[PDB]
Structure 1
């Protein structure tokens, strides 16, 4: 059963099709929180303190949002950005909302002897200590990528829903214990 510790989501990624043409320079000019820098990259970035997130707007009618803790919060942040864009004078719409990625982390509160794990799971558990302290493990059900550390913490990424993170954690836990 669980050790009483539930994985905690740390970032959520979502995007929408705005459905209208936009001008990067106009948005940069008319918005307080907009940042624009075509000499480096041709896109406008966006920031709001609630939900705490960073987003980008593109002239093609696209938006990406990240930094939220939950998928509903990322959708709220994205809709706030769409509201700002609409009130800036652009006929934007909230079309084709999708969640791309979300990151979670957890802990087991015991030391991890990584050498045994790499010696029993080398096929998928990529361990290399030199360049990077943490172990890297990719597993299939679902298609998640994991990072593992000696202190007992774990980082999980590549999921779309929190159920995937929970399932992956529950599957790995017996392997972590032994």
Structure 2
């Protein structure tokens, strides 16, 4: 079972510095409240995402359920701010990391599976449910829950998530 990407982080370097206020002035569906999360939030009709336009010019966007959708969205954000009295060349798009989720839906005896790793697997269920794991090839954080849900973060493309899923799958099985 390939694990669905539940979120994506994408970043881009819009060509120029921007004035947050103008954006909040012109498009004005951006809530800009300095000194609390000091960068403008924007959201659009489709796909559903938030995006932090920074005055300094760079940008992050999250909400896409696919690499292609994350692109398509960041493009729209670039287009919109461009209509706001600025020039920006959509460049250097990249996906610093994603997060992928999939639930096996059947608890397993994870006590011994934790000891199987020991140095990697840290397990304190009373503090908080789940189990934090590191997989070598490549580096990626895994959350493995007695409930059955597996979360993964740190990847850059779908292949990393799929291969980490499959690599840790028999161990938990």
TM-score of the superposed pair, with normalisation by structure 2: 0.95
Compute the displacement of 1:158 (Å): 0.9
Counterpart-to-counterpart distance in 2, 1:44 and 1:107: 34
Compute the displacement of 1:141 (Å): 0.7
Secondary structure of 1:36 counterpart = coil
Moved over 6 A (4+): none
2:110–2:172 Cα contact (<8 Å) kept: no
Compute the displacement of 1:99 (Å): 0.7
| Counterpart in the other structure of 2:40 | 44
1:16–1:64 Cα contact (<8 Å) kept: yes
1:133 is matched with which residue: 97, 113, 129? Answer: 129
| Counterpart in the other structure of 2:96 | 100
1:116 paired with 2:80, answer no
Which has the larger displacement, 14-23 or 106-115?
A: 106-115
Equivalent residue pairs, number: 173
Unaligned runs of 5+ in 2: none
| Counterpart in the other structure of 2:165 | 169
1:160 is matched with which residue: 156, 160, 172? Answer: 156
Which has the larger displacement, 153-162 or 101-110?
A: 101-110
1:102–1:160 Cα contact (<8 Å) kept: yes
Unaligned runs of 5+ in 1: none
1:114–1:135 Cα contact (<8 Å) kept: no
| Counterpart in the other structure of 2:87 | 91
TM-score of the superposed pair, with normalisation by structure 1: 0.92
| Counterpart in the other structure of 2:55 | 59
Compute the displacement of 1:155 (Å): 0.9
